[PDB]
Every structure is written in C-alpha cells, then in structure tokens.
Amino acid sequence: VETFAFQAEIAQLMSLIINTFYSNKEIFLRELISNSSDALDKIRYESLTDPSKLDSGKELHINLIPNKQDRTLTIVDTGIGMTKADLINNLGTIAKSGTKAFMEALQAGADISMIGQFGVGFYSAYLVAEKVTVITKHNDDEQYAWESSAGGSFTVRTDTGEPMGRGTKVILHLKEDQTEYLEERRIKEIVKKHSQFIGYPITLFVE
Numbered sequence: 319v320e321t322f323a324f325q326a327e328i329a330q331l332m333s334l335i336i337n338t339f340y341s342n343k344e345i346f347l348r349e350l351i352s353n354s355s356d357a358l359d360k361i362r363y364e365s366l367t368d369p370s371k372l373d374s375g376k377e378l379h380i381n382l383i384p385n386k387q388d389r390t391l392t393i394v395d396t397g398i399g400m401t402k403a404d405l406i407n408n409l410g411t412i413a414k415s416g417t418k419a420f421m422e423a424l425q426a427g428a429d430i431s432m433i434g435q436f437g438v439g440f441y442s443a444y445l446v447a448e449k450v451t452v453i454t455k456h457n458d459d460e461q462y463a464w465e466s467s468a469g470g471s472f473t474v475r476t477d478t479g480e481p482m483g484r485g486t487k488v489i490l491h492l493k494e495d496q497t498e499y500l501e502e503r504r505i506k507e508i509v510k511k512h513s514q515f516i517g518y519p520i521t522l523f524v525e
C-alpha cells in the first residue's frame with residue numbers, strides 16, 4: 319500500500335467541498351456519469367483502429383449499484399480504464415490549472431454545480447461521501463485500487479479483489495445523512511434530470 323499527498327490546490331478544493339454549505343448535493347452523480355461516458359468514448363474510439371482492445375469486454379455500459387447494508391453507491395463502467403500512471407502522476411498534474419480556475423470562479427460568483435467545466439467534477443463525490451474507493455483496470459496494466467477519506471492523502475494498491483476485465487468502478491461510502499442516494503426513486507429522478515442524453519445504457523440496480 320502506497321500513501322501519497324494530494325497537490326496543495328486539490329487538498330484546498332476538497333476542504334472547500336466538504337466545508338461549504340451547499341444543499342444541491344445531487345450534482346455529484348452527473349459528474350461521475352460524465353467521467354464514465356468519457357472513458358466509454360475513449361475505448362470505442364481506440365477499438366476502431368484496434369478491435370483487439372475489446373477482448374477484455376465488448377459491452378459498453380454504466381451500472382448504478384446501491385447497497386443499503388454497506389451504505390455504498392457504486393458507479394461501474396466498462397470504459398478504457400486507467401493505468402497506475404494515469405491514476406497517480408497523470409491525473410494530478412492536469413488538475414492544478416482547472417482547480418485554480420474553478421476556485422477563482424467561485425470567488426467571482428459562480429456556484430459548485432459548474433465544477434465539471436474545470437475538469438475536476440470527480441471531487442463533487444465528497445459532497446455525499448465520507449470515503450471514495452476507485453477500482454480500475456486498463457488493457458495495458460494490472461487492476462488498481464485508489465482510495466481517499468480526504469485529509470490531504472490518498473492510497474494506491476494492487477487490487478486483490480474480483481477481476482473486472484476493463485473499466486472503472488467508483489465506490490462511494492456515503493455520509494450518514496446522505497442515504498437518500500441509495501433510494502431507487504431518488505437515483506431515477508437524478509439520472510432523468512441531469513444525465514438523460516448519455517450515449518450508453520445506464521442500468522439502475524435494485525436490491
């Protein structure tokens with residue numbers, strides 16, 4: 319298990335998200351679905367020149383899995399996935415420019431719902447989750463588990479769990495007062511309102 323410090327600007331953004339009074343928390347779902355959709359577009363595009371990239375799975379979809387016992391909402395996709403390099407170094411350097419632009423925009427009168435326009439939409443997961451676990455598998459690498467409860471650090475380890483073939487799985491360990499995001503009617507309402515035009519099937523699992 320490797321422990322890493324977030325870049326200063328990311329730790330500052332994560333503290334703003336956790337501490338600011340903001341009732342419109344539901345925006346987290348649209349942001350994660352949009353990230354899954356981008357990964358699915360990436361695998362679909364690469365598969366045109368190289369069809370062998372779909373050997374780890376042909377089906378291109380998004381699964382929404384609530385679990386009231388574990389108090390978790392899982393977002394699964396069969397996108398391109400991420401390598402260890404994509405996960406750590408790569409998607410921690412790009413973020414700096416967008417993070418600074420977003421925080422400057424917030425001071426200028428913008429609200430938290432505009433987060434996705436700065437490519438840092440993922441961090442909106444901390445509006446509803448006390449801990450986020452990200453399991454990912456890319457064709458060129460092994461299966462990795464990323465995790466953070468904020469506090470300025472994240473961990474990365476080789477995942478010994480159930481193999482996923484290819485894609486990314488976001489496990490949101492929900493805060494005690496955010497269990498509405500485990501309700502079928504609530505999730506359905508959010509997807510219909512903010513993610514109705516996603517070009518991939520979205521399956522809301524029931525318990």
Ligand SMILES: Cc1cccc(Cc2n[nH]c3cc(O)c(C(=O)N(C)Cc4ccccc4)cc23)c1
Pocket residue numbers: 350353354356357358360395397398399400404405409440452454464485486488
């Ligand atoms: C912990 C962490 C590390 C890196 C990125 C993320 C964001 C994320 N949230 N939900 C996702 C779902 C995804 O399928 C992917 C992905 O594998 N790619 C290939 C798409 C992608 C979208 C947006 C940014 C980077 C990659 C990234 C994310 C979380």
